[PDB]
Amino acid sequence: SDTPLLDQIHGPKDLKRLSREQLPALTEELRGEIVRVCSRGGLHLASSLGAVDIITALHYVLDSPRDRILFDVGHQAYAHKILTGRRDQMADIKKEGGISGFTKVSESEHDAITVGHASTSLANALGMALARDAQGKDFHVAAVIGDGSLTGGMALAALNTIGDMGRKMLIVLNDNEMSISENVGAMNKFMRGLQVQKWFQAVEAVSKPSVNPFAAMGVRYVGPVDGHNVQELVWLLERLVDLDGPTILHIVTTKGKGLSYAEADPIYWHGPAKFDPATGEYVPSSAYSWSAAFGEAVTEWAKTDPRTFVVTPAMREGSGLVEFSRVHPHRYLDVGIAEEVAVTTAAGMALQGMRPVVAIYSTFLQRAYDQVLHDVAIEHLNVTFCIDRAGIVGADGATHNGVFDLSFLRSIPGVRIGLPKDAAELRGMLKYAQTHDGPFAIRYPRGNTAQVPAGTWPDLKWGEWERLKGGDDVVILAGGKALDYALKAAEDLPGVGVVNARFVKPLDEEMLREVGGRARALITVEDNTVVGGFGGAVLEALNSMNLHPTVRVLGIPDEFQEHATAESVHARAGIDAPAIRTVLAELGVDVPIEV
Amino acid sequence: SDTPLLDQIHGPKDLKRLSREQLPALTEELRGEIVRVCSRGGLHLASSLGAVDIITALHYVLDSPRDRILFDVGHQAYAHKILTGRRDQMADIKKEGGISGFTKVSESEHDAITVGHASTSLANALGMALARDAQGKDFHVAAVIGDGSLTGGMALAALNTIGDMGRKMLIVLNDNEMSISENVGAMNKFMRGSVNPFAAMGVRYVGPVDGHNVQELVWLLERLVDLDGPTILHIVTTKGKGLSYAEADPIYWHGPAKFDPATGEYVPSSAYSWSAAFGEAVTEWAKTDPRTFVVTPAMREGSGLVEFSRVHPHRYLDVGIAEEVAVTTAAGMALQGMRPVVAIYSTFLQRAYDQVLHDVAIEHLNVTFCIDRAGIVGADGATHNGVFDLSFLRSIPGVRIGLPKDAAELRGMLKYAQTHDGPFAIRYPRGNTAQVPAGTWPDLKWGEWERLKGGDDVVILAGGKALDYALKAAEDLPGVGVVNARFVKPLDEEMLREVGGRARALITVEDNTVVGGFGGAVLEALNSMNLHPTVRVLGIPDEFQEHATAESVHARAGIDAPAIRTVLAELGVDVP
Ligand SMILES: COP(=O)(O)[C@](C)(O)c1sc(CCOP(=O)(O)OP(=O)(O)O)c(C)[n+]1Cc1cnc(C)nc1N
Ligand SMILES: COP(=O)(O)[C@](C)(O)c1sc(CCOP(=O)(O)OP(=O)(O)O)c(C)[n+]1Cc1cnc(C)nc1N
Ligand SMILES: [Mg+2]
Ligand SMILES: [Mg+2]
Ligand code: NA
């Protein structure tokens, strides 16, 4: 066996039987284990490699699950799961029926919070410490937060409250100067100039038998220290966790520590495809994503429109903006993991005559709901939202599935919503949004679409649908990914109409009135919750027109969807092509049988 | 005339004709003018009094509207409106058809941002500075933010980006140690006591300086506004400065009722608000439930928690103006076995949408939301009307939603929520309700409605404020049924099926947008049951509602009792 130490560790109690001098050897086994787990592709390799040493030290010193160790985001906690009885389950992590890619309360007593969205650890830790003190209990509360997650407003504000309440708790700042891209913000720049302190060999331990970046927060500050010296981290944690009041332990780590390729390019290796651990060679993504189609379109658009300015909250790579940031460096802004700041900054740009585009994932746009409503929509400002990862994202699970934007955006006055069927329609909607008054939202899924030639800029009338298949008996209304399912379902069914409902706000009132009055039954399909989304919009509009056709609303049920493939989620939610054919048969359509 | 200087000032151009030695006298005229404007009651007196001197200095030094002066919240900007051509309109501020109580872009070229929610000034200012630099322009950007607004996460994160970008802009920190209550947070504690509190932000820091020395502020502003990079000018002000009563009690005089400026005597609001009913109920409940813990984001007074904070000091938390922190902190409490209650206005709960969804609902945690100012709030206008919570909460899995018809039903819903698994939301309007005896704790079945008036021809479904309209509308109409639809999630599926199948027409009424709210929920449920009755969905239209009385908004939205009777007549009901 390659891992003699790890073979005997089934939980933190087994870990504590090791001597402090054996801990370096254990971190090497953990790093080799994480590399093998991630070699199949699609996992958070570089972040978990960087956090191996602090996670080992935390479980050696603290007594989970009696003590609570909280991970911000949770993508860096693979070593945590390996050390808490889930080593064998790492083979199926993020697979349907397997363990989650992040810490999850229902999965283990050792997982203190369910995370995926960033910056929630500090407020959660405060709540647990206040609950502990209210109950007269005496356990440790520790939170691990990265330098990227620290840029979030809810982390900065929670720290302000944490310093005010002054309760016992430990915050480990896992500082690797990386978010997904290089980290941004003034705090990241300030901490670059902080010198590393040596405590255990013991210069700093002798000095206290030099500035606090959080001095105004009233929090004890220790560091920066070497985040990969596991014995020194143990030594420090033993001497900090029992002190009065809150403490920030600032550690410095190398993202991807232990794998040379990952250390050299921590951006790609944040989430690598299938790779060879011995060579670092990986399977390239030869596909053409919606993200790439958007990036090509907006990079092209900004060449002739000097008012276009793109803002992302820390997702330059995911939203497809790498080339844009290089071609238009003076029209690009990364606000860090602060969706709230991205939207309101764009509002200010629009007030001064710019045409800002907020690139943002559907699940992360949830963080900026009030900024869209209050800061953009009240004055009907020229902010365009290009919303990636719309609908089910799959393996990332319930914390990341963007199945709510058709509901929460639709109830905001003046926010137009479009679903492009292909890259040409995406360009048509982007062109319309950048040349018309008020806010526009354009949402598209994780996945691929065909490339279109440069200079593809069709004119479309916002709010008009397009019929794609003839038929007046039963008509399917769907856009985007749901439309692909609908066209596939009706592929061999003449008389089943299919309408590209490419606009959710406004609806095509004229076409819906005609189709709703002439059809005996309608089917709406959406990659979104059935609650208050596109189907609800159709029912509201039909009711206003006093039309009462039979309507089958297909979408994601009112339940969070666990990690699985999007195809599996959609099959069980009942919106894929076989499920639509089943509904068509229920409505009396002559659907061929399989026997 | 008592205001010889102000009589000649119709804009910042006129203001600059004064000498620097005349500016102290001008601030006195401004303070007296603001006192008279607010003497009719219902306005933001103490905040605008405290900001008189910095606003005068800013308009004396800067060149609005070419330069952009941004106010956070905007409630402190009465002197700004008086100095920018709206002095005469101050008589009708917050009245229907008058000017807004906050700065509003459509109202004046001098109003750089439309505000009401706090902490948006810094991100807005950054966007304007980046837009200016991208266009090659050279005007000043200045933001005025209070110490309370600085506790918001979106202000702290925006400051982190502001320091990163390093663009020309001035941030005036208007520090009076007050929010509505006394301010909270570590920054407030730190600033009470030669160090730059924002050193890690990479921002130039000047102060603290006297926020009421108008000539010194002018002198300082002249030597700061043209410097490279962002600057924080930290000023210290007294909330209510200029009125002895307001300085002595800046909490009440933040928004005083009708008062006599010469005596300080004011009309005591002896009404029993929904806020007071909640405060009484939760203070009572926490005496026998040690797991109850109440969290507010800076609204101890408004949510009715003054007595609670005094009786249960060890079960009370004020997180400042950080709704996001309030909800996720409550989630952590629930994870450790507590029964937290988040007291929050509907409009401010919008700030915590992701925290409700991601941090509370995914693990179905024991957080109870007591949602005040639900529906139209009226005079505060579009930035404050809480008409979206029935829509955005409803699409979150596992979040139950109740609308209590009175204080007894509120206690029944609070009791249920604090003793059952998962998150619960209870929403009630600004306004009054009857007091109930101590020990009123009825048992109710969450999700079941209650019919209040017989009738099968047309049946009205409504809860809360909308139910009051519905009962009044059907007052003399036999055969018009009225159902207390006191639960929006879940709906009473059994009663909706029976009523939807037997009635010729239904009316839904809600103090909420018609888009995706209660009416939408009824239509979705009816469609799932393949029932197709005639339905009239009544609610707030898909348009922001300007400041007016709630009754006026409801009359024009079509949900008050006369409007419902008109719909009943359209449905064939014999209305006299
Ligand atoms: C699987 O998706 P993903 O992109 O890898 C993921 C896990 O979703 C993350 S991880 C991440 C970077 C976090 O940076 P840190 O410095 O905290 O962590 P690290 O350097 O990796 O140890 C961001 C921006 N997001 C995206 C993100 C953005 N905004 C919010 C509110 N939460 C997020 N979590
Ligand atoms: C008319 O309603 P209101 O209560 O007086 C009002 C204007 O709505 C305000 S004003 C306010 C206090 C602001 O404190 P500051 O220190 O910034 O200002 P100041 O001391 O008054 O000069 C709060 C918490 N809220 C409430 C509030 C809470 N949360 C958010 C996000 N925005 C708010 N604006
Ligand atoms: Mg990092
Ligand atoms: Mg203040
Ligand atoms: Na626009």
Ligand code: NA
């Ligand atoms: Na509960």
